[PDB]
Amino acid sequence: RWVARRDYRGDMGFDYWVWE
């Protein structure tokens, strides 16, 4: 399952998607 990682600089609320 895709889980948003929160190190983001953008507006999207995620940076990269990690697979958990």
Side-chain angles (χ1 to χ4, degrees), residues 7-19:
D7 300 350
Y8 70 95
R9 296 286 293 175
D11 290 345
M12 309 180 86
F14 72 92
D15 183 353
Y16 48 100
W17 293 100
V18 172
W19 179 248

